Symmetry: D2
Subunit: 330 residues, 4 copies
């Protein structure tokens, strides 16, 4: 027969479980919840199985501590890693501090994807996002188009939400993109914000929103992750991160050709190569099918290049870790 789709969630914490719940609600495919922690993914998987019965969906949800259970996955979504570095206050939370904790996890996960599901589409969520996706790509041996990072869909959703709230319109009808690194140097593209294709500038000229208010929204978008960390007190955001990665997964599974901002492998676009960074892309059954090259103004391009320089600085730290290949398997 043609089997249900199979989605493995490497990491069964807050984002992992929430993504599994979306998969159950949406009947996307069978789900494997993998974690290093014993019993917990099996417990969440039982709860999620019960929830599938309530939803009248037909979804097997399996919890596991064994990588071999990811064999034959169509999609793999990776959240394995730490959310907050120890000995740091909430207010000084930085994704950058997670780097030395999370890089070695990416190598392990990569080696296991290489062994058990080398044909999967792989979405990395673990921070610091743009360099974690590079480590994973390097150690997994996957095709450049079959690995990407979730960040832009989340950052863009934030930008959209804040603009839509201010204008009092449906967020369906706001288009907004945030490109570059997933961090403080992300680049919300104000000039590209539209309301059903109507430039945001029209609304400014009509006095429905001011430049000052837009500038505030751009900064709120940059700071949104930390805003939620400060309010929650434990961990980080999960409902929107989960939804963002599932939107990407959906695009792959059903070959939708969505235009989504993701951290993608560049091969010369925007003047850069051999790194992953946030750019608009077409996502379909071939994975990252196209990186779209925006006609950025010199000012936007300078912001983007400065963003990329933050990824290059993190990449130097990854190199200073020294990670050998074929550590776990080959």
């Amino acid at each position: 027969m043609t089997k249900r789709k199979k989605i493995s969630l490497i990491g069964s914490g807050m984002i992992g479980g929430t993504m599994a719940y979306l998969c159950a609600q949406k009947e996307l495919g069978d789900v494997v919840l993998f974690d290093v922690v014993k019993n917990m993914p099996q417990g969440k998987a039982l709860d999620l199985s019960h929830s599938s019965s309530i939803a009248d969906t037909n979804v097997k949800v399996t919890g596991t501590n064994s990588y071999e259970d990811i064999k034959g996955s169509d999609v793999v979504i990776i959240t394995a890693g730490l959310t907050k570095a120890p000995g740091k206050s909430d207010k000084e939370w930085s994704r950058d501090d997670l780097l030395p904790f999370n890089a070695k996890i990416m190598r392990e996960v990569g080696e296991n994807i290489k062994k058990y599901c080398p044909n999967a589409f792989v979405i990395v969520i673990t921070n610091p996002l743009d360099v974690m996706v590079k480590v994973l790509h390097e150690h997994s041996g996957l095709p450049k188009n079959k690995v990407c990072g979730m960040a832009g869909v989340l950052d863009s959703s934030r930008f959209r939400h804040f603009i839509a709230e201010k204008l009092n319109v449906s967020p369906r009808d706001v288009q907004a993109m945030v490109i570059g690194a997933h961090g403080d140097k992300m680049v919300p593209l104000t000039r590209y914000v539209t309301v059903n294709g109507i430039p945001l500038q029209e609304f400014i000229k009509k006095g429905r929103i001011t430049q000052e208010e837009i500038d505030e929204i751009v900064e709120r978008t940059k700071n949104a992750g930390g805003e939620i960390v400060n309010l929650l007190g434990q961990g980080s955001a999960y409902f929107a991160p989960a939804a963002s990665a599932i939107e990407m997964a959906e695009a792959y599974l059903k070959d939708k050709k969505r235009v989504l901002v993701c951290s993608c492998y560049l091969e010369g676009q925007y003047g850069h190569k051999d790194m992953f960074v946030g750019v608009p892309a077409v996502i379909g059954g071939n994975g990252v099918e196209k990186v779209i090259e925006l006609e950025l103004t010199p000012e936007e391009k300078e912001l983007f290049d400065k963003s990329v320089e933050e990824v290059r600085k993190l990449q130097k730290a990854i190199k200073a870790l020294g990670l050998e290949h074929h550590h776990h398997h080959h």
Copy 2:
């Protein structure tokens, strides 16, 4: 108790039945299917009721030949009318030719809404759309914000589909608007086409689409209705018209504040007043909450004004039939 929403579909032909099906699938509210043809709406309502059981939804679908069954409707959607004028060929199909048959029907429907459901949000579909909506409005007594015509969501869906197909991207990510009259002088707004906010011009510059291809798509959008009439051989489009009207209805029922192009009563926007014509609008729980006045270029403004002039010409026929002015 708070009751389910009640949606009355005045006209139970192709579009009306298809809209009822969406209401059953989406569990939007109870549905009244009204028509002047005896027994037909009752038959469709039984079929639709069976289909709600299959969908596991909770929807009463009532077919009727009596206007009294529209009492208390939250939303009324009007498709009553002819699709093709008697004695005309398919090749010469024109929405304008429907005018003398359908205008009288709008008057009658309006009179009934006025007594039975004056607080409804009313969506007109019957062609020729922009003048039909004005007849309905005038004879119903409804507030200007509580009546509109479905056209621009359909015309825009065509523009979006054709652009998305050429670019090979999801239509979710194509924004395209068509404003003006729902007819040959509709105005597909090429300058406003975006792919997730990215101007279509960027894709031209990169050679992903040519200006000639866009020009073809613009004309294909204008001609889409008659293309489908000629292909089908019977009637006219209905799957997309139904979905477009239901999108509008959902925006009202759930106070969504959608930005949708609809035929709206103008009160000076674009330099025009006291007609309905297609414009971007915010649709929510107060109906047409705002008409958005685009910063049209002089050339776009001219195209819009020539579109409005087609509505004004049709309105002269309405006045000459004794149906208002």
Copy 3:
């Protein structure tokens, strides 16, 4: 790349177009609308394509007059055929009278499936359903588990709707099956009707429904198709038939293991073999995965056997037309 599912709809009339609309709303897969009428499926496909843009779904809808476009289909759903026999009144409508017109069409469709998409799961709708499915199966060469007819989900949806309406509960919570032939000798299984597993008998005992009311509902279920034919005046039911077939298709495409009554090839269950007739079945990725043999009472068994005998009589006509045996 793993491609989208491909669903071919052989017949692009009322049911075929409505099923395409569900596929577009539900984003089930790309759709091919095939018909012998030139240009009509192409027109509907354009309309449906526009409607997918409105739905924000990602669905190619292709209309065609060429069987070659069914190549590689995952699912094929067959509605090609007549709905009413020429020269008969509505009051005397009988599915049996369609047999000599529609049987030849099943042969032709089968021959094409055999070369172009022999690995498809095939759902037959064309009437008279139980014998049409057997002609298709025989001339297609498909495995017995890969072909079935849609009938029992529709008949059961009617039984469910009528019971749910009388009890004033959600039809989600009514389980009712109708087995046997899709015709006047269908068998609504009163003893198996439940409300969330609670036997209907409990509601009789409490006076929420009477035996006379149930008896009326049983007959209304049997007569439902012809009731809708008489009300509509044109054609026959389509909203519930479409939804029923799409429910079946979804069970296959997503390996759901739904328990649905379908016309299935019997291999000794109920004491019968080598015919298709309505039985409860588990539908999943291997098609008809299991026929469930109910513990019928002697009286129920007799009703089922008399239903099977109606299929056997129709099959004699099939043999006499030279279409198998």
Copy 4:
């Protein structure tokens, strides 16, 4: 205008947030997330707002620490309370130990519903469920039909899932009910389990499932909550509890006339009155529109009555708490 529906979630912890996410996904109405903990509901509400933008839904999600923000709620769902009593091991987890912690919370919540949204339909989740719903009803002054407890939909979903898994059929097609108290003396109604109306017994007679396997499933259903507590290590189940309460809310909001097992106020049915206990009911726009009286056999009825006696024993403990009315307002 006719406003969106308004759903207030009193308690913004694991179940509360998860219910808010379902409301955002399903576009059920605007959501108020109330909690006594400062900042946390506001943080979750931001994350959920972002997720609504991703979902293309039109949902306002507000976090609050003020009861007045529940004014005009159509539905109120209460999870306010403790999940695990202190100083107890996971293996000895009991809903009964939560009683003295949670009763006073119910009085406070009730008094505020009375003041701010007396026309709401109220779904209680806080354990120990059947007596918490009684405390809430007593102190809120709501109509008997406008308050109920979520338990049976969850317990029944579990019974359904386990049966459906064993038979390898869609859980849509399994009907199973668990009635009585939400605890160890719940009563899974084996005789009423059906597969599209086909008695489970047919499947036993055909050898597709054994009585021994059914008996195991009945006990697994009784123990399911504790099973998940043991596996998770922290807190209790949330994905299915949330889904269960939203299914009940949906039934109300859209007047669906669903047949759902809920903890309902009895007025003589089953031989009992003036308590809430799990029974099948029709749920629609009038709330609990009908309690269905099953034709229980004497053996099933004995199990049900013993279940009710557990609720009566908890109720005596509630009485021994002594709670005065008009403590917070009136």
